[PDB]
């Protein structure tokens, strides 16, 4: 599955491996270490999660299961795979975000700068990069008080274009000629960020018909009513 969390350092090496399977412009270890130790409340990761699911039991029980060698015997180690992070957890993508710190002789306010967003191509088209970008923007707006955001995009990559300009709905600022190593033109996009528009609770539904019922989370609700065992609404 997909599990969003904060980009930890104990896996940045593996994160670099994801770069080796994503953007050609790689970076050294110093770059990732600086960007992970300077502003850790911005860069996020998306991994997998494997938990229990009827251990042993009796209904069609079988002690010769896989479970990455964790059921019966077969020792208990980690599988030889650089993409794994834990016995039952592997990273599928991440997003690295930095803040403006270089001097520009113009008194620049604290703004958001999307450094990179790399997700495995085999694990896409199901809400990963969009959620990562939304969480990063929300965290920046809530902690660092980012006035706006500015990033870069390519041209032949239609997926990134549909994700930024169409899905996330970002505004194009300028066009940079020959910015990468291959000499390909890029589009620098900029959008003013706000606080009452980047809430996650306001984006719980993907599409709607015309006038539905958008239910959110108010105060208490799960600890109300009564016991679901012999009540009126008990199945």
């Amino acid at each position: 599955p997909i599990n969003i969390r904060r980009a930890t350092i104990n896996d940045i090496i593996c994160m670099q491996n994801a770069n080796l399977h994503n953007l050609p412009e790689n970076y050294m270890m110093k770059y990732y270490m600086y960007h992970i130790l300077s502003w850790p409340e911005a860069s996020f990761v998306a991994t997998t999660t494997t938990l229990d699911c009827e251990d042993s039991d009796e209904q069609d029980e079988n002690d010769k299961l896989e479970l990455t060698l964790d059921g019966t015997n077969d020792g208990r180690t980690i599988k030889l795979d650089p993409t794994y992070l834990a016995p039952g957890e592997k990273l599928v993508g991440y997003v690295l975000v930095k803040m403006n710190d270089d001097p520009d002789q113009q008194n620049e306010p604290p703004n958001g700068h999307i450094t990179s967003l790399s997700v495995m191509r085999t694990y896409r088209r199901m809400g990963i990069a969009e959620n990562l970008m939304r969480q990063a923007l929300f965290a920046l707006r809530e902690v660092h008080q980012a006035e706006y955001v500015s990033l870069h995009v390519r041209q032949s990559n239609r997926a990134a274009l549909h994700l930024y300009r169409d899905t996330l709905a970002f505004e194009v600022l300028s066009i940079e000629k020959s910015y990468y190593q291959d000499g390909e033109d890029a589009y620098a996009m900029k959008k003013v960020l706000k606080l009452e528009e980047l809430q996650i609770s306001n984006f719980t539904h993907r599409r709607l018909k015309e006038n539905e019922e958008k239910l959110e989370d108010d105060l208490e609700s799960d600890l109300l009513e009564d016991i679901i065992k012999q009540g009126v609404n008990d199945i």
Partner: protein, 838 residues
Amino acid sequence: LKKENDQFLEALKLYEGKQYKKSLKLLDAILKKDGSHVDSLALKGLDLYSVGEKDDAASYVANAIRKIEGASASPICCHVLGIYMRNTKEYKESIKWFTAALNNGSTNKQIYRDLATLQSQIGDFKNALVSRKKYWEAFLGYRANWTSLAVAQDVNGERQQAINTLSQFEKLAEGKISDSEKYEHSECLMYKNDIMYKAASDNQDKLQNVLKHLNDIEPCVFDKFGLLERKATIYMKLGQLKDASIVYRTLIKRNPDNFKYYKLLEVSLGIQGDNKLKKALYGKLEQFYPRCEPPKFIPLTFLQDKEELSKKLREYVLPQLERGVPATFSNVKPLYQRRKSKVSPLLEKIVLDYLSGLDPTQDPIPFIWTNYYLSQHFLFLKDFPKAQEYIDAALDHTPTLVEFYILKARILKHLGLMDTAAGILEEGRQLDLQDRFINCKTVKYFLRANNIDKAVEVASLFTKNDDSVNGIKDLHLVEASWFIVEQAEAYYRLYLDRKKKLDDLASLKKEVESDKSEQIANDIKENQWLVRKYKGLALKRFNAIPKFYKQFEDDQLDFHSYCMRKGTPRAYLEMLEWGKALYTKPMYVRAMKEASKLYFQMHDDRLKRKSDSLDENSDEIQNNGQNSSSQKKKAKKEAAAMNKRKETEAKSVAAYPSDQDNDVFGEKLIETSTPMEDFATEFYNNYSMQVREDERDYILDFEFNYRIGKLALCFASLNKFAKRFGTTSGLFGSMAIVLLHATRNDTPFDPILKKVVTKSLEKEYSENFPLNEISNNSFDWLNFYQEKFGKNDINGLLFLYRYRDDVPIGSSNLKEMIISSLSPLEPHSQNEILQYYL
């Protein structure tokens, strides 16, 4: 001593700025008049090391060190020597020189901060605390000093002292904080909370005070995720369940896509015993987040009814098959690792019933996604013909998907067809040349297909090509690992195939008229030379991943000061944990195991070919001599051609610069003096000093301690393995048999160690293995092993076959048993074991 000191003081400003040639000229002019100047030599060494030279710089530094008797000179020389040692990966000498400089009389307190970094790399915190205290008492106008003091007092043990220091600092600087210094302050607050966590323990009053402080600082702390996490932890450590549930619901509202928050809420609510409560909770939460995945995946783990489970699986797979996601099988990947004969039949039936109502023209996308899911499910169930049929139907329906080619290559690899898989995957990759993941997969599958040249040619495309014909240098500069690991395995396989090739060639031994194998030998000799050169290059490339990790650990120099200047103590602790856990990676363990295997094989075959056979004069002749046919000119031309070919080959496989490493051919690594000593002082001490408890490879430790004369470590590792992973494993019995055969008086070792190991075995395991059958040559250990642990274990049989020369328990019977026991596995593994492991 009068004018030389003045010239040194006037030239020091050149090193202080951005000048090197002007300082080197002055140093040369000074040395031309007096060569016994320690300061000039110490400065020239660092100047030559900072421009590119290494040999001359090291020579000048060694000369300056030799020209020093006592510890009474100028502090500038000691400071330069400390800088040089810090730049040459020397921490102890740098600390010693800085301490000797500070003990003489230096009015620069910043030098102390340098020590506060240097010891921070070696873990020496006893003196680091005093250094931090001195550097804090020296300058009282920077928050970095307070942060460093707090970190030093927290890591050591002065928790109350750190709390009091932080409170005093916040009281003295209450209101004098700028805007940009707010966030950092918040971070510091969080760090103080962490300190309060160390003061939490299980006391009620302490937890209440921590909760009150957190609620008071909440309007000031900018970080909300960690704040709410700590609040929920405090609520769980107390007894308030409603407040903890509210905090977890707020966390879910902030980020619903998180399995950890859902599991923590399930633990807090205390409804893990009843299934209906959790079912109703997840059914109510699904209406709040219809676009998420955990709220639809977690409920598939505690369902008992068959109809309800089938309905939930159908409602979970219908949107994924309708929208079409390239991870549907992934969405059921962990479940298949825990369920099988109970869940997979229902899923297969649902998928078949859904496919029976589709159409190849009306709904082509759901059709191809259903075909892909069926192929994945059958590949997971050890099926191959039906999976190939489905993937062929999918390619005939829509041949414009890379995932289909990837699955076909994976199936062909599992069926032992590596070359065909590589060909299909290259053909599919040629369809769109813009993705790097498919390129890496193609390179890996070509490396697994005994095709290295084509793999390198394919990889040399997206890499930066400047001072090299290919992109090997670029792959080494982007800090790679998997590529080197996959290429070294191919080199090892190609080197091992030559053993069987030479065995098959020598089995004939010129039987009757067999002039074909005698008249044709130059090509075979050239092939053997190339294989040996590539095997040496593989060992050379192996000496990179540990070097890369050492470089990563050493690059943390400026971080010790940056984490204190910027104000990230939590990031500093995370970096410390990362540096401590660097030596706990699976790729590192795999590379270390491969290097150990290579070193042991080199030791074995070197000791075998050292004193064996006879007539060295008739064997050390080699070629380069055709009697009366101009042997000198022929040998000269052959050597010239060999050098001309080797130069081009080294330029093609160029990875390391010429001025940084001269051992390009790798002839010095394969013929070292003490391989075990080097492996222990370079690859074993770090893993021995930085390792946990449950995560420890005992097989590698046993193999390393076997051929050194220390059996107590072997016995301790065996006992720990038997206590942790039980005693019902074939590896335990194999190691016990190996140890019992090693403790025999026939093997030349230490009788005292053998006797104490025998006593320990008789005291511990007295009713497990017969310890009185070492004198009977008719007792078969293979029969006893297959009666107790059985022959179904593969690792034990592989270990026994690897260690069969010292343990005489047969050979042909063991090979036949291994062949008979390998049948209930995968064909590719069986083929690999029969080709290389057997």
